[PDB]
Amino acid sequence: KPMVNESDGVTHALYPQEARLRNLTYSSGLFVDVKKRTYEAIDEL
């Protein structure tokens, strides 16, 4: 859901009215599952 990252670290919900008054952006966070695999061969498998 839409959130805001204030100057003092704290993140909290953000309603449309607070956005319009404090000139913020009514945006929410995008999160993606990332995986990092590793493989190796000697001088095909």
Partner 1 sequence: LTCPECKVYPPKIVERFSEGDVVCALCGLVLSDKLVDTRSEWRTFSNDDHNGDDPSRVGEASNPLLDGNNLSTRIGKGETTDMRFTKELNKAQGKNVKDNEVQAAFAKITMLCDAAELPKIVKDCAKEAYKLCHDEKTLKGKSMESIMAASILIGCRRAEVARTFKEIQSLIHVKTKEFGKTLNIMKNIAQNLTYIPRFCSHLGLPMQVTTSAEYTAKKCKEIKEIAGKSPITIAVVSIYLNILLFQIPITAAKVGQTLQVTEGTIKSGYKILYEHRDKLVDPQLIANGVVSLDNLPGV
Q: Which residues bind partner 1 (CB under 8 A)?
A: 5, 7-12
Nearer to partner 1, 10 or 41 (CB): 10
Alpha helix ranges (H) inside the chain: 16-21
Closest approach, Cβ 38 to partner 1, in A, equals 22
Q: Which is nearer to partner 1, 12 or 37 (CB)?
A: 12
Q: Would you say 19 and 27 are in contact if contact means Cβ atoms under 8 Å apart? A: no
**Nearer to partner 1 (CB atom), residue 31 or residue 39:** 31
Backbone angles phi, psi at 17, to 5 degrees: -65, -40
Q: Which two tokens stand for residue 23?
A: 């000139």
